[PDB]
Amino acid sequence: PLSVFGDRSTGETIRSQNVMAAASIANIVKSSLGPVGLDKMLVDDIGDVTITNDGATILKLLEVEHPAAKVLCELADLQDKEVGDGTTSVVIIAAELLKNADELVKQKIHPTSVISGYRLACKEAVRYINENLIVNTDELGRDCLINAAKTSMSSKIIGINGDFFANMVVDAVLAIKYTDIRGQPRYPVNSVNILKAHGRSQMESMLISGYALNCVVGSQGMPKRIVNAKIACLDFSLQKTKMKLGVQVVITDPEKLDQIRQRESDITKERIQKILATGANVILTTGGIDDMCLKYFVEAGAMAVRRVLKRDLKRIAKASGATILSTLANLEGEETFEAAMLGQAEEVVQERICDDELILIKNTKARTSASIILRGANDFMCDEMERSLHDALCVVKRVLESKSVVPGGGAVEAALSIYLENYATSMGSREQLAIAEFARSLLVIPNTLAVNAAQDSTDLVAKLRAFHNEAQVNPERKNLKWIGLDLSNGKPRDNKQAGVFEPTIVKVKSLKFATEAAITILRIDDLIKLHP
Amino acid sequence: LAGEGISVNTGPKGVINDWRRFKQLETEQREEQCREMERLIKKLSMSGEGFLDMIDKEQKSIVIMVHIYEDGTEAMNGCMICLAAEYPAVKFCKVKSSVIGASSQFTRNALPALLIYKGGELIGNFVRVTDQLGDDFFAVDLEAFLQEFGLLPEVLTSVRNSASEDSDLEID
Amino acid sequence: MMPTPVILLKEGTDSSQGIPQLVSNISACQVIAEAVRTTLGPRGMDKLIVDGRGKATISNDGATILKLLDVVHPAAKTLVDIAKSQDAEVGDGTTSVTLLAAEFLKQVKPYVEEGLHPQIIIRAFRTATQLAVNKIKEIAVTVKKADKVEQRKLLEKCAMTALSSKLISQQKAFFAKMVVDAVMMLDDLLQLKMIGIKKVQGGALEDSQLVAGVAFKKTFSYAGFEMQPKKYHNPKIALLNVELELKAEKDNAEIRVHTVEDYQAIVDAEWNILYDKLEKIHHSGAKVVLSKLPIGDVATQYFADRDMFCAGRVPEEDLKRTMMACGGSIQTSVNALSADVLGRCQVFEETQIGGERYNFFTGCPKAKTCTFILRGGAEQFMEETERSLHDAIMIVRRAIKNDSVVAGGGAIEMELSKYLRDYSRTIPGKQQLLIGAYAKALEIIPRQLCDNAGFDATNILNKLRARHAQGGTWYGVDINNEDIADNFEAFVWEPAMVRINALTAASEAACLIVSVDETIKNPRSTVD
Amino acid sequence: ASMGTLAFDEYGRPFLIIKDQDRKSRLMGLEALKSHIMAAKAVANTMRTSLGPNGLDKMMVDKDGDVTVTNDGATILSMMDVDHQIAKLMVELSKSQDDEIGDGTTGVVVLAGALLEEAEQLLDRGIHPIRIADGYEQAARVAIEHLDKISDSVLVDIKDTEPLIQTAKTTLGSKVVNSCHRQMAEIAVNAVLTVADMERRDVDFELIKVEGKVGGRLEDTKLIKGVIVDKDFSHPQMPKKVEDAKIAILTCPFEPPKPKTKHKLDVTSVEDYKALQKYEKEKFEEMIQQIKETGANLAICQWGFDDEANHLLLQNNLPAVRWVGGPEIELIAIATGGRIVPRFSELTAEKLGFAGLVQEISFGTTKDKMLVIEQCKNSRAVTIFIRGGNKMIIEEAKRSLHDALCVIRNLIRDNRVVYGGGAAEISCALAVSQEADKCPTLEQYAMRAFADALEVIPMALSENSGMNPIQTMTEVRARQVKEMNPALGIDCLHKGTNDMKQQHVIETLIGKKQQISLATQMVRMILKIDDIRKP
Amino acid sequence: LLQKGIHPTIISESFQKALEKGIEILTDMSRPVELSDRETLLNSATTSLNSK
Numbered sequence A: 001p002l003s004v005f006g007d008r009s010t011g012e013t014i015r016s017q018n019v020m021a022a023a024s025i026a027n028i029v030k031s032s033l034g035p036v037g038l039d040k041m042l043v044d045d046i047g048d049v050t051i052t053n054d055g056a057t058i059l060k061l062l063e064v065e066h067p068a069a070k071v072l073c074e075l076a077d078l079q080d081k082e083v084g085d086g087t088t089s090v091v092i093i094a095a096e097l098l099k100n101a102d103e104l105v106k107q108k109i110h111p112t113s114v115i116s117g118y119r120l121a122c123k124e125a126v127r128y129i130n131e132n133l134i135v136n137t138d139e140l141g142r143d144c145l146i147n148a149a150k151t152s153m154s155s156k157i158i159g160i161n162g163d164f165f166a167n168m169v170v171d172a173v174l175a176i177k178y179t180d181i182r183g184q185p186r187y188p189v190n191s192v193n194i195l196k197a198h199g200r201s202q203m204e205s206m207l208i209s210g211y212a213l214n215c216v217v218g219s220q221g222m223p224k225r226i227v228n229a230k231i232a233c234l235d236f237s238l239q240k241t242k243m244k245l246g247v248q249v250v251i252t253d254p255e256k257l258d259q260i261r262q263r264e265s266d267i268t269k270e271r272i273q274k275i276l277a278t279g280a281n282v283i284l285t286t287g288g289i290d291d292m293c294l295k296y297f298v299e300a301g302a303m304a305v306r307r308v309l310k311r312d313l314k315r316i317a318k319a320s321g322a323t324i325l326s327t328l329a330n331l332e333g334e335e336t337f338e339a340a341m342l343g344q345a346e347e348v349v350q351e352r353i354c355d356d357e358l359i360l361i362k363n364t365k366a367r368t369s370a371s372i373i374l375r376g377a378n379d380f381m382c383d384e385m386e387r388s389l390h391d392a393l394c395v396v397k398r399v400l401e402s403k404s405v406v407p408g409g410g411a412v413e414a415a416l417s418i419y420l421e422n423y424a425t426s427m428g429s430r431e432q433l434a435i436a437e438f439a440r441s442l443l444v445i446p447n448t449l450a451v452n453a454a455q456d457s458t459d460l461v462a463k464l465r466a467f468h469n470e471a472q473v474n475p476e477r478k479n480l481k482w483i484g485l486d487l488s489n490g491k492p493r494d495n496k497q498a499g500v501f502e503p504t505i506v507k508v509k510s511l512k513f514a515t516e517a518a519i520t521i522l523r524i525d526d527l528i529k530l531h532p
Numbered sequence B: 001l002a003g004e005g006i007s008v009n010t011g012p013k014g015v016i017n018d019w020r021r022f023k024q025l026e027t028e029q030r031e032e033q034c035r036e037m038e039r040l041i042k043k044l045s046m047s048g049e050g051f052l053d054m055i056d057k058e059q060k061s062i063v064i065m066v067h068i069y070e071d072g073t074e075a076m077n078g079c080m081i082c083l084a085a086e087y088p089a090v091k092f093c094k095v096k097s098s099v100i101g102a103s104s105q106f107t108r109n110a111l112p113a114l115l116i117y118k119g120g121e122l123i124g125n126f127v128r129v130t131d132q133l134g135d136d137f138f139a140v141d142l143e144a145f146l147q148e149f150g151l152l153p154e155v156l157t158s159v160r161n162s163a164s165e166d167s168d169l170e171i172d
Numbered sequence C: 001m002m003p004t005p006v007i008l009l010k011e012g013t014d015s016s017q018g019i020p021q022l023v024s025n026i027s028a029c030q031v032i033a034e035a036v037r038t039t040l041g042p043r044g045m046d047k048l049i050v051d052g053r054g055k056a057t058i059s060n061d062g063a064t065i066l067k068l069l070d071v072v073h074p075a076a077k078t079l080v081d082i083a084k085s086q087d088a089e090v091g092d093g094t095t096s097v098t099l100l101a102a103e104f105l106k107q108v109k110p111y112v113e114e115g116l117h118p119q120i121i122i123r124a125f126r127t128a129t130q131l132a133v134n135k136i137k138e139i140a141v142t143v144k145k146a147d148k149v150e151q152r153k154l155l156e157k158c159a160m161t162a163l164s165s166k167l168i169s170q171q172k173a174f175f176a177k178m179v180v181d182a183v184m185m186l187d188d189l190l191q192l193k194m195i196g197i198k199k200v201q202g203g204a205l206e207d208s209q210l211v212a213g214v215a216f217k218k219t220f221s222y223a224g225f226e227m228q229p230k231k232y233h234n235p236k237i238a239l240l241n242v243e244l245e246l247k248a249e250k251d252n253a254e255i256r257v258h259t260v261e262d263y264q265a266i267v268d269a270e271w272n273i274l275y276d277k278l279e280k281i282h283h284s285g286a287k288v289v290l291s292k293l294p295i296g297d298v299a300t301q302y303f304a305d306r307d308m309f310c311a312g313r314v315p316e317e318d319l320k321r322t323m324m325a326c327g328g329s330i331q332t333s334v335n336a337l338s339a340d341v342l343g344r345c346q347v348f349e350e351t352q353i354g355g356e357r358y359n360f361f362t363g364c365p366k367a368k369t370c371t372f373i374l375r376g377g378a379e380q381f382m383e384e385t386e387r388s389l390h391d392a393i394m395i396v397r398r399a400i401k402n403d404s405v406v407a408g409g410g411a412i413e414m415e416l417s418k419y420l421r422d423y424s425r426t427i428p429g430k431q432q433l434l435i436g437a438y439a440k441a442l443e444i445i446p447r448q449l450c451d452n453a454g455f456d457a458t459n460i461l462n463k464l465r466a467r468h469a470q471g472g473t474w475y476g477v478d479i480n481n482e483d484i485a486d487n488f489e490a491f492v493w494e495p496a497m498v499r500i501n502a503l504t505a506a507s508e509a510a511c512l513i514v515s516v517d518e519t520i521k522n523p524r525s526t527v528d
Numbered sequence D: 001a002s003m004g005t006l007a008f009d010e011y012g013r014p015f016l017i018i019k020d021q022d023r024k025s026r027l028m029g030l031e032a033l034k035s036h037i038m039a040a041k042a043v044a045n046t047m048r049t050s051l052g053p054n055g056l057d058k059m060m061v062d063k064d065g066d067v068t069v070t071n072d073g074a075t076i077l078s079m080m081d082v083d084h085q086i087a088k089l090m091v092e093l094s095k096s097q098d099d100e101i102g103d104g105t106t107g108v109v110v111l112a113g114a115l116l117e118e119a120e121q122l123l124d125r126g127i128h129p130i131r132i133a134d135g136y137e138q139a140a141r142v143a144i145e146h147l148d149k150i151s152d153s154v155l156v157d158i159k160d161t162e163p164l165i166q167t168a169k170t171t172l173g174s175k176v177v178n179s180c181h182r183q184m185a186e187i188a189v190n191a192v193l194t195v196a197d198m199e200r201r202d203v204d205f206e207l208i209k210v211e212g213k214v215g216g217r218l219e220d221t222k223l224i225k226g227v228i229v230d231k232d233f234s235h236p237q238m239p240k241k242v243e244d245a246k247i248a249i250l251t252c253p254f255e256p257p258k259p260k261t262k263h264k265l266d267v268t269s270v271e272d273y274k275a276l277q278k279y280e281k282e283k284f285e286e287m288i289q290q291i292k293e294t295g296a297n298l299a300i301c302q303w304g305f306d307d308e309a310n311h312l313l314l315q316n317n318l319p320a321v322r323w324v325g326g327p328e329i330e331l332i333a334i335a336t337g338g339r340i341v342p343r344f345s346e347l348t349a350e351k352l353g354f355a356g357l358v359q360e361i362s363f364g365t366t367k368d369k370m371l372v373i374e375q376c377k378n379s380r381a382v383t384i385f386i387r388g389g390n391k392m393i394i395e396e397a398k399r400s401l402h403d404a405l406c407v408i409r410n411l412i413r414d415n416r417v418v419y420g421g422g423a424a425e426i427s428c429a430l431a432v433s434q435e436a437d438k439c440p441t442l443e444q445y446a447m448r449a450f451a452d453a454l455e456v457i458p459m460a461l462s463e464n465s466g467m468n469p470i471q472t473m474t475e476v477r478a479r480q481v482k483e484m485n486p487a488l489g490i491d492c493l494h495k496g497t498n499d500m501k502q503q504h505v506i507e508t509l510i511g512k513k514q515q516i517s518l519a520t521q522m523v524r525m526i527l528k529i530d531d532i533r534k535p
Numbered sequence E: 001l002l003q004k005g006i007h008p009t010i011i012s013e014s015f016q017k018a019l020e021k022g023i024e025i026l027t028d029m030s031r032p033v034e035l036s037d038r039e040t041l042l043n044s045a046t047t048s049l050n051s052k
């Protein structure tokens, strides 16, 4: 009757398929949650091997066919983009919410009522988190940042070495700190150039008090160490001059060909002479440099680096005070290069790192910059350290920007579950079931942590819920709001005292994104799949 | 035996589902037939879906060549591996004839196939290269032979360098 | 895992172990329960299944539907097995057992996913089932008066309740009275083979009748049969197992003669043997002759000459029913055809029923058998009517064995769930969650009733829970009134043993499914 | 909406539950109901064109190329090669109506289709199908009670056969034999009345032989108050006509006796051989003499005989026929009043049948002969001999006569009749509508849908006759309401009057009741089904 | 309607008559609204967005 060239699913079938797909995506990454979680290996069809614990990377690398699974994968990607941490918790929470909402729907509860209940529960959870479970970081000091970094690097390849990696992360983030208009301290992460090089152990990873380039000097005749570096940043190639498309050379008097050919290279020669005449020592360009210009730099005893990355060049110019010049043209139609466009550094060296060389611009002036050189056993290990390091940097940035943190280890989830199951009795008649299911779904995080720890999940979560219920009922027991999970010993523990923190924005964004994804999937009750 | 003006009328619109399914299957076989016919007769005289959608995809500005083989194939495979190590920008790959299901004449007398694709068209269809190349020539010989026709394209980091758009801003 | 050139098991062996395989087993059980989910209750609907040969089976019976389903999942087969067990021991509740088991598994699935040890769940199921069975036995209503009228009414009400879910539910009182009447005439053992069920195409349901005797189809009459009278007013019936026709005396017998006089003597001796058997039957005084073995045309004409009715090739079960109704004895030899070995009925007659001829033996005062003659518009119609009457007959037989009844419509399960929740509120707490899950899963049947009827399940569930909590034992789902009502006063009655067996089988299936941790599938041999 | 459910688990492990689950299909709930209703509607719409005197025939071709032209709904649906299960259910419903009644096999299909069509629009409005079935059952009970109320009784006496002739004519009007309509109805009535247990008992159709031969004309069809057999006299030189024949029915071949037991006869000398030859000759002479001594004129055997017996029968002025079938032997014995004798030694004069005339019938230039026995004293068995211009109309006449015989049999069983032409069903629809106005509102929709479905057959009759369906049906219903006359129907033949009592359109009450009941039960089943699991 | 034996041209004209009558009825039911009344516009927008 429809005569539609495709398959159709309607009613319970499509809802069950969507929930099964979401649950499968959840179960894919449920084994990499919490410090007792374990990494996974992803192998391509060409033999490429990837070892990672990050949920977003795992979901990006996998091939996904079902649209709901695609929704969850893009939810994880969005959570990574907007926050940088919690990319697994958001997926798990969204899948659990979808499962509980589908169970409610199978109980003949209309999906609109469930959606309204989920919206109310999300709003009240955000409000309760912002009003009760936040901890101000002003009175905690640098220990708060250290603990946040250590918590973020748990369940990662650099977990046990956290005592050192957290110091590195905090130092780098504080080094790249700057202030903008209206006095907001902004921390531009991704300005920390993360360099990888296998070899010696992790503890030999170096935090550079400057910048690091993954490139070497163009010529072997140039010195590989300059003390008082006058860095000149350029955005144009230094090679033989060639006329543009609209300019053509036509010779009628043969005596002028030699002069033409000489001028052709003398133009670049005089440009290099103008650049060197101001005392420049290090010359970095995004374009290439041919042989004669390299020799010109060699004879002057000055560095010259070609094919420098644009972002690296911009960072070097910003840190050292230099300005990038795409051309040597002033405001009076001449070629010139003043000393004002020269950045300065305390030292520029080409260091050797495991049979390979890289350039270290050390201790730039007028601005502090940082870079990290990661040393690992092999390439996969270095990649995983880089991913974990980026996650830690993002967490520290979130903590420094917004000065509120919340206890970790499922304490927030248990407190929210207790508060929501108490609050659901206050409003509505059919939405109360939805809010109760939201509270129950919020408990998937501590349960997953306990399961990963191979502990008694039921008893441990029951004890956590009892502690939080006592905290919420007794007004003189507010100190129990911080009772999290001690995964090493499998017992409840005051996580705020133990130093297990995480940014409030992580939880807020995870809750909002998971609620929106569950709502989006829940509206679907009919599928049409046209044949290709 | 009359009524030559059948005028099937509602039939085709009432059974259009099966007709369109058969049309889709026949067209799916049609792309494979068109792809395989570019080799047979055209040059012979003088999973398959993976090959099809690998040829369909990727940029037209990158030269991609494929090799058809059956189990001196080993020497040419080694030379191809050496060229791949020497030309990372190229995407050397090989596929069995039985997977493609080519003609028996190609299987019996055209085992060494050097098929080069550039933007969905055959810029080179070197087939049965035993006579004009040899049996044990090295990778450099194959590179020179292929570069003589202007088909093949013309430092080392530590391990890796690659990793919001706010690069760095010190402005107050 | 490594290729390991020499391998342990046979190549192609599939193994699944851990929590995921248990979760998959639970999901398969839910899938099986969904296939018979909508067939429960007066508002239930039938299912049609087509086999490879093209035959279609229409049935509301859960056991039949599960049998026609070609399940291959090892965990899913347990639900079909327990449905077969419930059908065998009880005959009703085959849909309830699968739903109960699947709901148990669904309720305990979240605890399984979080690492709970299966043995704890098994122990909780055993304890809850024991308590529920004890409660059912305690609160079941029985009347220790042995009054004929009230016991008959109880049988009829149980039959109507067991019948008020099928396509014959419109005539449920009529068929219930027929079934109770048929069962009461069985002697001591209530053997199912003593209740003949004949299906005749054509005619309405109300045209179906119960015969106080035996009736069977006409069986390939020979020539001269239409010359026999087809009605008798006090016949004597000769129940025989004899081949009455000219034939070789023995398979290995051989006759050797060397004189034409001996030849004529031999042919006359054969004819005299046949005529002597027929003469003995005739002077036995019988007017109706029935035999397992064929009755020849010569014997048919001989009996027509004497104004008797004959019927050969009668099925064995039909002759057994005729013997038990008329009160004779099946004879393999006709030499001693005494008076006591002859059946007797008040009226024998051959009548046409929907294009078929049937022989009727009515008026038997001491008959111990019956005969259902079912009418309908299609063979599947008669098949489903027979299945429904079989369910009713099994229920009536069980009620005869013990008249212990509980109210239906989910009232018994509300009482059990309330009792189990009250018990679970008084234990440490590890078993409390599992027993509470069991009590919650006990609510599946009334919820399914409401869903099938098109109600709002949540409101009816809340009303039933509130009614049972503050007092009231037999309050269940009232389908017609869109509300709840006291089902015991509404005569929605169920034998207690039905629910006892249902709970026991569901609990055993759930425990067996949970107790399995690994599944191994050896590669098939001789696939052909 | 197909291929069952495919999950393959949430852990990526295989999830196989039902064997060949990927090759099976499934429909759930309302979609299955819609598909079944559509299939039943298609079948009913195919059948409805062949309803009434103006109904047209269907030309059915089997798998072997044999083609049958017929108007009987049961015959059409039986030969139809359907694959939908609901179509098979409709075919079985029509066959059930044929088996129970013999007439109205087309009305049941149309009524069921209309009921399901109305149930479709009831389902669209959100009514549980069980509620629709219950309402249909209640309305069917009301309609059956109304039919019983408005029923009329007729005399089924042998002396006056006018009402029986009218009923048979009403049955035969829709068939192709309406050219010989009255003669065919008379033949059917006489055939049923001649062989019938008078005390309202059964009518044994096995005692009515319906055999047809090509050639002649339809008007040549006649009722023979005896038995007609396609055999002929064994010897070509015996007389072809015997009057006042004394039949001698025998089941013993006219051959020397043979023991059934495995036997061997030993010839040990010449005198033994002479004795054997003399014994054979004397056995032949003795069987012939035993047959002749009873005074019989014609001898009928069943297992044939050999040359010596044939020539002795010819020589002794004893016409004989051989290889007569068992049923034919029984029919001859019943009609002639003579007994069946198993051997010559038991043949007496009192066991001889009597026949007024035994004749051999030729059939033009066909070389085929056929023996006829008639003019018996009180022949309790009759045979109908049908002639036609082709075998196809012969088969159609056979089934039409079967319908007429079944209708007269139903009249024998019950003498209450109702007036057809759609009058009875219009009155039933009126009664159902009146009853619905008093019942609660929820079942009102089901009862009114039942009334609308009942009113389709008069609409079909009006449409087949070319009249406007809705206008004619509305006018007839208004006349029925205004003047109390449940006999006003659809003037299909354009006789100028709407009163079926004057038009003598008579239907058996049992037929209408069976139609309504069977249609209601089949509709209830089709509504109750909500799942299909075809492979 | 077609099954009852009505030509599919009287149906069209009758449907046109019914459409005209229904348009008249809907116009009679309607209520004037001014663009300066923000409440009615907000209610209309909310009703439009309610089903999404």
Ligand SMILES: Nc1ncnc2c1ncn2[C@@H]1O[C@H](COP(=O)(O)OP(=O)(O)O)[C@@H](O)[C@H]1O
Pocket: A032, A033, A034, A035, A053, A054, A055, A084, A085, A086, A087, A088, A089, A090, A151, A152, A154, A155, A407, A408, A409, A410, A445, A449, A484, A485, A486, A487, A500, A502
């Ligand atoms: N030392 C710790 N003790 C207890 N819980 C922790 C500890 N470190 C992290 N957690 C908790 O483990 C959970 C899982 O974090 P993780 O999965 O590693 O982050 P992501 O979701 O970004 O991958 C976090 O919600 C955090 O609260």
Ligand SMILES: Nc1ncnc2c1ncn2[C@@H]1O[C@H](COP(=O)(O)OP(=O)(O)O)[C@@H](O)[C@H]1O
Pocket: C039, C040, C041, C042, C044, C062, C092, C093, C094, C095, C096, C161, C162, C164, C165, C166, C408, C409, C410, C445, C449, C477, C478, C479, C492
């Ligand atoms: N009149 C009624 N009102 C409410 N519920 C009923 C009624 N009759 C039967 N039931 C319910 O229907 C269920 C039985 O459904 P059915 O499918 O016939 O057998 P099974 O027990 O195999 O499911 C019983 O649990 C009973 O509670």
Ligand SMILES: Nc1ncnc2c1ncn2[C@@H]1O[C@H](COP(=O)(O)OP(=O)(O)O)[C@@H](O)[C@H]1O
Pocket: D050, D051, D052, D053, D055, D073, D103, D104, D105, D106, D107, D170, D171, D172, D173, D174, D175, D420, D421, D422, D461, D490, D491, D492, D493, D505, D507
């Ligand atoms: N002379 C007539 N005038 C009006 N209606 C008639 C006449 N004869 C038959 N009919 C109607 O035609 C309908 C169809 O009858 P028929 O085709 O013989 O068998 P079936 O009922 O199986 O189709 C009957 O319901 C009957 O009421």
Ligand SMILES: [Mg+2]
Pocket: A085, A086, A152, A391
């Ligand atoms: Mg993290």
Ligand SMILES: [Mg+2]
Pocket: C092, C093, C162, C163, C165, C391
């Ligand atoms: Mg039952």
Ligand SMILES: [Mg+2]
Pocket: D103, D104, D171, D174
């Ligand atoms: Mg008729």
